Design a protein around this nucleic acid. Structure first.
Lengths: 96, 154
RNA sequence: GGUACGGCGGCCAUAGCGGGGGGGCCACACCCGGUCUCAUUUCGAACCCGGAAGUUAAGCCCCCCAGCGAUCCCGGUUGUACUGCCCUCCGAGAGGGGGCGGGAAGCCGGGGACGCCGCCGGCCA
RNA sequence: CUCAGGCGGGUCAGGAAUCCGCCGUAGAGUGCAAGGGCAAAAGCCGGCCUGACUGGACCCGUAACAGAGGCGGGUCCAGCCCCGAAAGGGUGGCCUAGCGAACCCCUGUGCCUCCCCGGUGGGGGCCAGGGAUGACAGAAAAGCUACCCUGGGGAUAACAGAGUCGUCUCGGGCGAGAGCCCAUAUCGACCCCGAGGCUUGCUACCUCGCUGUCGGCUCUUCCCAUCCUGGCCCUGCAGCAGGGGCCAAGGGUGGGGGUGUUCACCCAUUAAAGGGGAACGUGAGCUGGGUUUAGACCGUCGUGAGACAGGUCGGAUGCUA
RNA sequence: CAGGAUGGCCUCCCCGGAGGUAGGCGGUGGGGUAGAGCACUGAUUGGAGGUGCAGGGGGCGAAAGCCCCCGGCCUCCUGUCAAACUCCGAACCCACCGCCGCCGUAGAUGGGGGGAGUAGGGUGGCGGUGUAAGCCGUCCACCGAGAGGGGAACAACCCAGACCGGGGUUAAGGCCCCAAAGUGCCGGCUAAGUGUUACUCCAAAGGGUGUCCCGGGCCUUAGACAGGUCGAGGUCCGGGGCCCCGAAAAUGGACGGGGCUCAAGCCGGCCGCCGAGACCCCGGCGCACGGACCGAUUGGUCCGUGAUCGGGUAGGCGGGCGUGCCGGUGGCGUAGAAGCCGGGCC
RNA sequence: AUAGGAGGGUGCGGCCCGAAAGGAAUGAGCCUCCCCGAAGGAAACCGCGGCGACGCGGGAGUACGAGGGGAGGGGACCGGGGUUGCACCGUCCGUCUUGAAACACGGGGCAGGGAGUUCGCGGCCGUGGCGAGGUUAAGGGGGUUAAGCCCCGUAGCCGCAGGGAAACCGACAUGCCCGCAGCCGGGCUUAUGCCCGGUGAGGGGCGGGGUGCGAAAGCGCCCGGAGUCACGGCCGCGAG
């Protein structure tokens, strides 16, 4: 039986937190800041449901090209297409 | 250290990664030899393509004989002592000694092709091309013994 | 510069749970009383307001431990289980094997671990 | 503010009504499946509210890479507001389901427009919301054909071949036992390992510009897992006989009753009246009783045309090698 | 649903002008598969302790309740599990950055336009399913769309990817004859024609004082075993190699055949030869790109590079050969046109 | 008239033909001798290693080697063709199909005939004319044996201004940056060529502007002049 892709399809383990990490995350990731041109990894925080990108892009590394409101604008290369995502800084991690 | 690498197996039933590794190593055909360094990147490439090549350490005498016999320039012109002396100022033996020592590289000789197209060995390969040299075949790393094979293939 | 003083924090258990000993210049508390501010789906129990009669019993501060939990290092199991590439290697089959490259989990023994760090203020000097 | 559950103590009060204390990482709850997330909350209890609003921009998913009508979601700008001391939050439900093109019609609102011009009634257009197509990327819609026809298909069934052996036929390993004692004279539970392609099934690999079916008659040949004939071994083999097994395929294995039957049953003989393969051997050798067209009857089912792997009567067999 | 459309994959032309990433090394991050384990969720054998715990069975009491057995619920020990479990956790894969390597100014990455074909795939490894065959996906290696040399013939297995004329050496593999190359060498095994099979084809459970060996115990050279007498090794066990029994099919017959026994079989090694269009060399052709020189309509001659050009179905693109007639231009023919028959040359 | 494969492939032998068009008495097949020579490449013999098959150093990169040249002798064939023999190899042609020799379909022989054509609309390319303009249609005049040839013919169509359903409104003849080719200056290089710095058409990006929706911000489309006609070709759609 074919199943169409949805936001939470096959995310039982991808979007699950460690038992010892249950609860609110430390505020450093919430309040972290980035500059245009910086490269950041995408690590979705399951507890925060705002500004979450599609889980298909979890684990990828993109580049910051702007900032709208509280969310950062991240550009990724899916195959040959350029895809633009609006990701909250809590879901991002600096490279190196 | 300088490593001589010779392709052993053919161009059929070769998967894309190994084929592209061989193309980057410039070993497009059987009985073709190249000289590279023992840097980690080259070692990783050799490990990736280990099932179709044999490589080893080459000494200065073998390198000089290989340059004199199977070395060629652009247009497949032979490499001669007069040309080597005119371009660099020393003999082929001294050039090979310096290259092996690491004081210069083959690219220091102008218009020198980086691929030596060898001849099939005299008496043939003394092992099956499906096993490794350690088991008794003709594949993989064989160390200093690559010099004997190069001698048999000129 | 000293202090068994406090406020705001970072990593978020190698930091927790449970035990033993010591301490109050200051400071933090327990504590005394509910007119005023504030509240009980009753209760000044909490929260709030006004204080210093008494206490270091405990919250707190300092030192220690290895019973539980967690986790770092070393040795054995062990290059064991598993695994990437090639193969005219064996096997009736199931499967296994050779070469090159990686490599656990758990258990046993010996150590570690009862947190580390940033900014500032109070008191004394 | 902290849940579920548990322990100890309490007038009726008990397993279970209400209350005090302690342990209690969520073992509860979050409207509804499951997964994920939630502990000074996203749960429970209260106060005040309608941001489940208006005009727009960009982006992700359905639909990776890699095209998309419709739909869902995310990040924001502006307007008017809600809660709060403030920070801050609010574009429905903590996240992932609960739904739908064109044309036409209804409603809201405030603009444009209708053939020479102007007024009126009426019509048309732009924006927003709604009425559904579940075969859910959106036809309005019941059957028989055996009187059937056409184009095709070994992309696809029935007969036959091929693969497989669950099933079928035939063996083997161990030995609980039954046999007056004694497992193995004979039978051999519960389990386990096989051979054959002689039953049936499964697959759909060859064959639909045709490879003519079942049974019977005629004729030829082959296998052994041997029914009799030849020779042996064990015995719970006294003899006459029996039971089990071994070598052995030269020869034989017949005649009749009902039934289209193969098979099975029965009769009188017999040394015995064996099982199978050869395109389920053999229709350019025969017969045509059954099956499987076109005619007809009965029973059942159907409103009906009609149908029945239900019976019943009749129903063509081409040849100059 | 035997058919179409949008994409993916092919081909031809153009713009633009400096980067690109199939392979590797190191780094910054992501993951929960294999394996493993019981710390949640659900299973799972027995025992010990605690709890009367709303259970049941008896004895026992007017009645308030006792005494045991069993059962339930917790802790520990013991023995086992999980595709819809995870306190752990690889190999490996993916994203990004620096470097090595390779490609690119003889123009890549990228962009625009023209033309398609393709919507039945197969074999092979892996995963779900099924007794199996098979069915359904996945990996892109080979056939499809692929020559040559081998496996006896073979689509798929091995070598190998191919312009033309020659020379040489190797690859798969092979060397008793068929059949080119050894009745080749050293050590051991088999007595069954077992075998003579890399794979497309190949029979098991259970047994064998049949043989060749390894390891571990008891007695153990007139103190062992077999029958107080002899007077030298026996007793048992667990394993390894080859072989044997288990082992029955239909036209006459299959190691390819003949045949082969200190092999022409197997096991551990070695030596020399033979063997492709593969690799090397000489000569020739074309193609792609760049260059010089020369053409009154697409071009022509020559040079330079090609280890990094030369198979090919669907399909795309370029050049050339042939036939009837028209406008020109130059001609042939009764001293023999067209046509036809057999030959020479290009 | 003792021999097996789809009737063929490679090489040569036997028999036979062989005037011309192919070479050749200005010399053929053939015989002898000399020089050079790619990749490749022995052995007699001597010394040594190994239980052995055998190997190693010298001989030696020698003899030989595809091919490239020269000289002498002889004097008529060589190339080519018909048939057949030997050795090795080879299971026909077209077609659907994953898969054809097929027990899958179309296939007695030969000769002639036989299947992407025409129009209309549209996209694109090769070339040519004119160019902010381009081009004619129907038709008319001249001339001609003639329908060929010459001139005229602005109606019409496309373009020059776009946005909007409509009413209606109504834009850069270059303000700035980056920058390829080309040009200029300098350095190195025998030269080609490379590098640095300016200027830079075309190209890319800002800024500004017209209009639609909006209270506005803000977005969509458009704006700093290249189009039009003709010939030929590919394709899409409708006609058989």
């Amino acid at each position: 039986v074919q199943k169409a892709h949805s936001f939470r399809r096959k995310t039982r383990k991808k979007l699950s937190k460690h038992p010892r990490r249950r609860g609110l995350p430390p505020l450093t990731r919430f309040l972290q800041e980035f500059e245009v041109g910086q490269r950041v990894h995408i690590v979705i925080e399951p507890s925060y449901h705002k500004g979450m990108p599609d889980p298909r892009f979890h684990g990828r590394t993109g580049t910051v090209v702007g900032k709208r409101g509280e969310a950062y604008i991240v550009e990724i290369k899916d195959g040959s297409k350029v895809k633009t995502l609006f990701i909250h800084p809590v879901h991002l991690r600096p490279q190196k | 250290a300088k490593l001589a690498v010779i392709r052993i197996r053919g161009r059929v039933n070769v998967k894309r990664p190994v084929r592209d590794t061989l193309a980057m190593l410039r070993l497009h055909r059987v009985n073709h030899c190249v000289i590279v360094d023992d840097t980690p990147s080259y070692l990783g490439m050799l490990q990736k393509a280990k099932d179709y090549i044999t490589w080893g350490e080459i000494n200065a005498e073998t390198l000089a004989k290989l340059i004199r016999k199977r070395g060629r320039l652009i247009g497949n012109k032979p490499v001669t002592d007069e040309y080597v002396k005119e371009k660099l100022g020393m003999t082929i033996e001294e050039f090979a000694q310096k290259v092996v020592n690491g004081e210069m590289s083959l690219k220091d000789l102008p218009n020198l092709k980086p691929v030596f197209r060898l001849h099939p060995p005299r008496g043939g390969f003394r092992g099956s091309k499906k096993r490794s040299f350690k088991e008794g075949g003709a594949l993989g790393y064989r160390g200093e013994k690559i010099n004997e094979l190069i001698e048999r293939m000129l």
